[PDB]
Amino acid sequence: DYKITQVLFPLLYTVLFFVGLITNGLAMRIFFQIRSKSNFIIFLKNTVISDLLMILTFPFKILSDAKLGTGPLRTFVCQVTSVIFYFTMYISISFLGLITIDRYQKTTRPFKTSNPKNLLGAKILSVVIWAFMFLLSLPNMILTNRQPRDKNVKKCSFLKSEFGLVWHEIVNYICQVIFWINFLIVIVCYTLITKELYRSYVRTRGVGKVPRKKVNVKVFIIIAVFFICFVPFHFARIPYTLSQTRDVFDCTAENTLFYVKESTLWLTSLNACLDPFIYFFLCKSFRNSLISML
Amino acid sequence: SAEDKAAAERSKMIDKNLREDGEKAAREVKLLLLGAGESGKNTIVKQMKIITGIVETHFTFKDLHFKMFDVGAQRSERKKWIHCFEGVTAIIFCVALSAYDLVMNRMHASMKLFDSICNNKWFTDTSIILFLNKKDLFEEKITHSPLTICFPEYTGANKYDEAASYIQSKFEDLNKRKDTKEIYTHFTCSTDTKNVQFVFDAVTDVIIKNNLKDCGLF
Amino acid sequence: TASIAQARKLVEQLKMEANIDRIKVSKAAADLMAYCEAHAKEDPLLTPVPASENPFR
Amino acid sequence: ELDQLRQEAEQLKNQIRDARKACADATLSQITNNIDPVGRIQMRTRRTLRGHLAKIYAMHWGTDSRLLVSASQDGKLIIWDSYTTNKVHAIPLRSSWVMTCAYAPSGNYVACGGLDNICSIYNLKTREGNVRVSRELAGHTGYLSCCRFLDDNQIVTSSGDTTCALWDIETGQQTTTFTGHTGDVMSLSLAPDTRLFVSGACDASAKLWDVREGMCRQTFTGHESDINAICFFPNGNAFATGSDDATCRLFDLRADQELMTYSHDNIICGITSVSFSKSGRLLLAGYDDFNCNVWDALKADRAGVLAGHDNRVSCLGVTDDGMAVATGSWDSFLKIWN
Ligand SMILES: CSc1nc(N)c2ncn([C@@H]3O[C@H](COP(=O)(O)OP(=O)(O)O)[C@@H](O)[C@H]3O)c2n1
């Protein structure tokens, strides 16, 4: 029994949910209306699909958190809904990294064009990463065969076998490594993109400064969103994994551990409705399409 | 169905060839030249381009293929064919620095031409590579003739550095967008591999913006 | 001479273009309607033909 | 001298205007109330010909109502098979700037031209091997607006030099020069008898021209803006002119009158292509509002909408028998409607 304020917490999600339910919807018809011109379009479509899946998983999570029995709904949420939410969020991370890589390639190598073979390869890579995330998430959904031993508690860390627990720890370590690699790649590529734009501007325009800061203020928005909403989750993920798998942390530490982990999880889930907003704020064509829709 | 199969095979081969040609065309850079006949437009062509209404000039610089287009021979209405230049990488506008007092002034005629080109519905997102050529002649002509006769708005003193820098700013204020179109201004010189060097950088700058506009960064 | 030759040509053309015989607009409208009704049956655009003999199905 | 000539021209112009007003006793719309309107017409995209990679500007149908030809800014002129949706031919163009596209009545030659002032006519037979250059007419100083084949040995080209040219394929040189316009020409169409063709320029007038003599028959100063779309009625005694002020005006030859106009509040954009039907009851026009309209030539009301494109329309075509309609709108795509 952490606190009664637990009931207050999924309310944020539904405040996060309803608006999200329309934002991805706004991105559902606009992003898919245009054809697959380049790899960025495919990656953005996959990202909005992942965000829609996040929105689909949210009401189950809020129902489990607010008030629900351990048996009928908590086991179902912890078995598939939670795991699908996690690997879809990892897929969104990977596709954000792919978008950053595509932008870096388009900036550093501007003369290279996107061929049909390049689009086919990008689609193949998307399918491969989707299948990879599904394959790693499958044991996390099939190894939770243990029945709930206790009905009063809602923590589903005991609903998993010893091999299930060791595979869960391996999955956490692998996904932490993947996230760190993707984060460093994104940071490096965005810094290189800003440097390349600055160099191009000083080669062409010279000592101008007014439009040079326009790209700096928009790149930082992506960096800020990817930092303040993904990174604290992975700072707090390792202690939570150690507490769930091992017993190295004591009882009173579990309260603040759960609090910070769940708050960081909410911050991560905010990205589902944040990504449509930032992607519409960045590209002017998306704003034009949204205005024409109204 | 042998005839149908042969027709399908021919269509597939034609489609492959057309895709290859389209890739080759998209890899190359298209630039449209605009301005006046006596503004030094032909001076830029006869610099390093070793390789009848349109004068097509093709040259390779740093493993990049360019395609210049000249519309000087088209002595007709511009708006009936200016829409055919959609998707060009940039517009190379050439205006003479020394043509401020030739007579209905030459500078006013170029500004009126530049105003229509820069503020038309066809080149809203197309950058302009402005060229203030013939800067060498501008040095010995600024002292004899000031800019007061062209317009009384020049409160500043008449100097080669001051006038050339200020007359450069006389073209950006004509741009109403100032967000989708960026005007790149350069003064032509006789230095080897220096005038075309700016064009390569200007093309790279607009392409980078174009390569990121569809990528969501703009 | 050169500044007036084109004017003379234009006025002569406009003068001799008015010597043609013109029929009433009602007769022309009647002929147009008659031609429209004569080929109305053999017009796929006016009458949507069945897909059986339609080469674009 | 000049003042006297100007005064005489103005006097004769007002005299001819008074004669035209006296000739118009009853308008077409006043007597059209007897015929039953066709009503709403539904036309769907049967074939989507997606082979081009640039903005298509012109096309033309063959006399066989099956084989067409299209021109875009990719430097490729594509002869399409509309039946099986395949590329019969694809010929490179030395100039990517092409705005005209004509197809020979016998189907052996195809012409293309544009900003290069040169009309290139290529032989579609080429039994000796690959396609090759056949003729290159270079006598125009304008952007070579449009071209139309009279036969295998005569082609009429209207250009941006305010003049029209009738050429000969065998000789390769201009034969007849049409000099009546005051503004540059944008489009022209040939009559079924191939003896009297109308031409539209940007001086808000449509002028008739005879193939043999070359003198101007009639002039219609009906519109108030530049005319860029024009086509003959199937009988050959009427035609339609489309301007950029959302105005399509029908002009009769023998009547020599402004007959009826497509003035509507919804349309405010320009017009690019105008065609007719087999019987001429349907007038298919293309507007800058990203879709094509199909008006009733008699009832003066709209009957169909071809909203399938996502860009400005540039080329419209209707077969001789009216079997199908081809639409191409700046999107490298052709759409077939029935
Ligand atoms: C590739 S999908 C994935 N990735 C992780 N890093 C994960 N970390 C934990 N999970 C599983 O996510 C669900 C709930 O997360 P946990 O933190 O392990 O348990 P709770 O604190 O009750 O939410 C369980 O089914 C876990 O097996 C994960 N699933």
Short mmCIF file of C-alpha atoms in Angstrom, two decimals, chain A residues 30-256:
data_model
loop_
_atom_site.label_atom_id
_atom_site.label_comp_id
_atom_site.label_asym_id
_atom_site.label_seq_id
_atom_site.Cartn_x
_atom_site.Cartn_y
_atom_site.Cartn_z
CA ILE A 30 -2.61 13.39 -42.82
CA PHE A 31 0.58 11.31 -42.70
CA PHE A 32 -1.02 8.37 -44.54
CA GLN A 33 -2.63 10.62 -47.17
CA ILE A 34 0.71 11.46 -48.78
CA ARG A 35 2.58 8.75 -50.68
CA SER A 36 5.82 7.06 -49.60
CA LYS A 37 8.13 9.61 -51.19
CA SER A 38 11.20 8.90 -49.03
CA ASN A 39 12.37 6.84 -46.06
CA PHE A 40 11.32 9.58 -43.63
CA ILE A 41 7.68 9.14 -44.67
CA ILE A 42 7.83 5.39 -43.95
CA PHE A 43 9.54 5.95 -40.60
CA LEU A 44 7.00 8.63 -39.62
CA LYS A 45 4.11 6.34 -40.56
CA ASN A 46 5.62 3.57 -38.43
CA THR A 47 6.11 6.02 -35.55
CA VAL A 48 2.50 7.21 -35.70
CA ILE A 49 1.35 3.58 -35.86
CA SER A 50 3.37 2.91 -32.70
CA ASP A 51 1.82 5.98 -31.06
CA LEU A 52 -1.66 4.74 -32.00
CA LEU A 53 -0.81 1.39 -30.40
CA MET A 54 0.32 3.30 -27.31
CA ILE A 55 -3.05 5.08 -27.24
CA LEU A 56 -4.78 1.70 -27.57
CA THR A 57 -2.80 0.27 -24.64
CA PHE A 58 -3.40 3.29 -22.38
CA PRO A 59 -7.05 2.63 -21.33
CA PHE A 60 -6.18 -0.90 -20.19
CA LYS A 61 -3.37 0.55 -18.06
CA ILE A 62 -5.63 3.21 -16.54
CA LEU A 63 -8.32 0.62 -15.78
CA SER A 64 -5.74 -1.61 -14.09
CA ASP A 65 -4.21 1.25 -12.10
CA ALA A 66 -7.41 3.00 -10.96
CA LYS A 67 -9.39 0.04 -9.58
CA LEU A 68 -9.40 -3.56 -10.78
CA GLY A 69 -9.00 -7.08 -9.48
CA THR A 70 -5.64 -8.79 -9.74
CA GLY A 71 -7.03 -11.82 -11.57
CA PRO A 72 -9.36 -10.67 -14.35
CA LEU A 73 -7.51 -7.56 -15.54
CA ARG A 74 -4.13 -7.07 -13.85
CA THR A 75 -2.77 -10.38 -15.16
CA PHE A 76 -4.01 -9.56 -18.67
CA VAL A 77 -2.43 -6.09 -18.55
CA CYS A 78 0.91 -7.35 -17.19
CA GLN A 79 0.96 -10.29 -19.61
CA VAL A 80 0.43 -8.66 -23.02
CA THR A 81 -0.80 -5.05 -22.83
CA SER A 82 2.15 -3.77 -20.79
CA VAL A 83 4.69 -5.74 -22.84
CA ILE A 84 3.23 -4.59 -26.14
CA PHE A 85 3.30 -1.00 -24.87
CA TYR A 86 6.97 -1.38 -23.94
CA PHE A 87 8.17 -2.87 -27.21
CA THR A 88 6.07 -0.44 -29.26
CA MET A 89 7.71 2.42 -27.34
CA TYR A 90 11.10 0.84 -28.10
CA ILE A 91 10.03 0.65 -31.76
CA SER A 92 9.18 4.36 -31.61
CA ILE A 93 12.65 5.00 -30.15
CA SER A 94 14.26 3.02 -32.98
CA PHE A 95 12.24 4.85 -35.64
CA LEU A 96 13.11 8.23 -34.13
CA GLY A 97 16.74 7.15 -34.42
CA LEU A 98 16.18 6.09 -38.03
CA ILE A 99 14.60 9.47 -38.81
CA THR A 100 17.60 11.21 -37.23
CA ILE A 101 19.97 9.03 -39.27
CA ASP A 102 18.06 9.83 -42.47
CA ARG A 103 18.22 13.55 -41.70
CA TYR A 104 21.96 13.28 -41.02
CA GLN A 105 22.51 11.48 -44.33
CA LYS A 106 20.43 14.06 -46.21
CA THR A 107 22.40 16.89 -44.59
CA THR A 108 25.94 15.52 -44.90
CA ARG A 109 25.30 13.92 -48.31
CA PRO A 110 22.72 16.23 -49.94
CA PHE A 111 23.36 15.13 -53.54
CA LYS A 112 22.41 11.49 -52.91
CA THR A 113 18.83 10.75 -53.99
CA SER A 114 16.41 8.18 -52.60
CA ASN A 115 16.01 5.38 -55.13
CA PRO A 116 13.19 2.81 -55.19
CA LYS A 117 15.77 0.28 -54.00
CA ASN A 118 16.54 2.57 -51.05
CA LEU A 119 12.83 2.73 -50.17
CA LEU A 120 12.60 -1.07 -50.41
CA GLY A 121 15.62 -1.42 -48.13
CA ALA A 122 14.11 1.01 -45.63
CA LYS A 123 10.86 -0.98 -45.62
CA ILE A 124 12.84 -4.20 -45.13
CA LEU A 125 14.72 -2.64 -42.21
CA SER A 126 11.42 -1.48 -40.68
CA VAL A 127 9.99 -5.00 -40.97
CA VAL A 128 13.19 -6.48 -39.52
CA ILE A 129 13.21 -4.20 -36.47
CA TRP A 130 9.47 -4.78 -35.95
CA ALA A 131 10.00 -8.55 -36.03
CA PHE A 132 13.05 -8.27 -33.76
CA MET A 133 11.16 -6.29 -31.11
CA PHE A 134 8.23 -8.72 -31.36
CA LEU A 135 10.59 -11.70 -30.99
CA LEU A 136 12.21 -10.27 -27.86
CA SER A 137 8.79 -9.30 -26.44
CA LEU A 138 7.32 -12.78 -27.05
CA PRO A 139 9.04 -14.51 -24.08
CA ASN A 140 7.97 -11.60 -21.87
CA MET A 141 4.38 -12.47 -22.84
CA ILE A 142 4.53 -16.28 -22.84
CA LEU A 143 6.72 -16.90 -19.76
CA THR A 144 4.26 -15.21 -17.36
CA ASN A 145 2.32 -18.44 -16.85
CA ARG A 146 2.43 -18.33 -13.04
CA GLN A 147 -0.92 -17.61 -11.40
CA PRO A 148 -1.17 -14.61 -9.04
CA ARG A 149 -0.18 -15.92 -5.61
CA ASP A 150 -1.46 -12.81 -3.79
CA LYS A 151 -4.64 -10.90 -4.61
CA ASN A 152 -4.10 -7.85 -2.39
CA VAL A 153 -0.85 -6.73 -4.03
CA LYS A 154 -0.91 -5.35 -7.58
CA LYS A 155 2.80 -5.70 -8.38
CA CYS A 156 3.13 -8.43 -11.02
CA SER A 157 6.84 -9.14 -10.53
CA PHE A 158 6.04 -12.50 -8.91
CA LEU A 159 3.98 -13.68 -11.90
CA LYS A 160 7.08 -14.95 -13.72
CA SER A 161 9.38 -17.95 -13.52
CA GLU A 162 13.10 -18.01 -12.71
CA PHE A 163 14.01 -18.45 -16.38
CA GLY A 164 11.39 -15.80 -17.08
CA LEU A 165 13.11 -13.47 -14.62
CA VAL A 166 16.61 -14.02 -16.04
CA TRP A 167 15.32 -13.50 -19.59
CA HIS A 168 13.53 -10.36 -18.38
CA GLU A 169 16.81 -9.04 -16.96
CA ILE A 170 18.59 -9.88 -20.23
CA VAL A 171 15.87 -8.04 -22.17
CA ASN A 172 16.22 -4.99 -19.91
CA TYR A 173 20.00 -4.95 -20.37
CA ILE A 174 19.79 -5.36 -24.16
CA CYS A 175 17.11 -2.67 -24.48
CA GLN A 176 19.07 -0.29 -22.24
CA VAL A 177 22.12 -0.77 -24.48
CA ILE A 178 19.96 -0.21 -27.58
CA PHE A 179 18.45 2.96 -26.11
CA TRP A 180 21.86 4.33 -25.11
CA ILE A 181 23.27 3.64 -28.58
CA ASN A 182 20.26 5.29 -30.22
CA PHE A 183 20.42 8.31 -27.89
CA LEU A 184 24.13 8.90 -28.52
CA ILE A 185 23.57 8.46 -32.27
CA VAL A 186 20.71 10.97 -32.21
CA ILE A 187 22.72 13.52 -30.22
CA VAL A 188 25.80 13.16 -32.43
CA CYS A 189 23.79 13.38 -35.65
CA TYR A 190 21.85 16.46 -34.51
CA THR A 191 25.06 18.23 -33.45
CA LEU A 192 26.64 17.37 -36.80
CA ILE A 193 23.52 18.61 -38.62
CA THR A 194 23.64 21.94 -36.77
CA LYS A 195 27.36 22.23 -37.52
CA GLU A 196 26.78 21.47 -41.22
CA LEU A 197 24.01 24.07 -41.49
CA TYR A 198 26.21 26.65 -39.77
CA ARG A 199 29.12 25.86 -42.10
CA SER A 200 26.89 26.05 -45.18
CA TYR A 201 25.46 29.39 -44.04
CA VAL A 202 28.90 30.89 -43.39
CA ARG A 203 30.07 29.64 -46.80
CA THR A 204 27.06 31.09 -48.67
CA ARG A 205 25.73 34.07 -46.69
CA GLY A 206 28.81 34.81 -44.58
CA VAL A 207 28.33 36.61 -41.26
CA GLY A 208 24.53 36.44 -41.13
CA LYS A 209 22.99 35.30 -37.85
CA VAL A 210 19.21 35.93 -37.83
CA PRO A 211 18.14 32.80 -39.78
CA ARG A 212 21.01 30.72 -38.37
CA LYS A 213 19.26 30.52 -34.99
CA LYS A 214 15.99 29.39 -36.60
CA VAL A 215 17.32 25.85 -37.11
CA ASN A 216 19.00 25.82 -33.68
CA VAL A 217 15.76 26.54 -31.81
CA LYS A 218 13.88 23.78 -33.68
CA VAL A 219 16.58 21.11 -33.33
CA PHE A 220 16.71 21.72 -29.57
CA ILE A 221 12.97 21.00 -29.34
CA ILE A 222 13.54 17.48 -30.67
CA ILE A 223 16.56 17.05 -28.39
CA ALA A 224 14.64 18.36 -25.37
CA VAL A 225 11.69 16.06 -26.09
CA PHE A 226 13.94 13.02 -26.52
CA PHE A 227 15.92 13.93 -23.38
CA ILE A 228 13.38 15.00 -20.73
CA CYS A 229 10.96 12.20 -21.70
CA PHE A 230 13.12 9.15 -22.46
CA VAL A 231 16.38 9.49 -20.50
CA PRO A 232 15.09 9.77 -16.89
CA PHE A 233 13.10 6.59 -17.53
CA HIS A 234 16.31 4.70 -18.32
CA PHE A 235 18.12 6.27 -15.37
CA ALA A 236 15.42 4.84 -13.08
CA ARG A 237 14.93 1.60 -15.08
CA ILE A 238 18.10 -0.16 -13.83
CA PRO A 239 17.31 0.12 -10.08
CA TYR A 240 13.72 -0.98 -10.75
CA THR A 241 14.93 -4.01 -12.72
CA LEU A 242 17.36 -4.90 -9.93
CA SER A 243 14.60 -4.58 -7.32
CA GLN A 244 12.17 -6.68 -9.38
CA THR A 245 14.68 -9.44 -10.18
CA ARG A 246 16.97 -9.46 -7.14
CA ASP A 247 16.43 -8.49 -3.48
CA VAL A 248 19.41 -6.17 -3.06
CA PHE A 249 17.16 -3.17 -2.27
CA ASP A 250 15.20 -3.10 0.98
CA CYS A 251 11.45 -2.69 1.51
CA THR A 252 11.22 1.05 2.20
CA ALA A 253 13.21 1.82 -0.96
CA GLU A 254 10.48 0.19 -3.07
CA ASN A 255 8.09 3.09 -2.43
CA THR A 256 10.23 5.85 -3.95
#
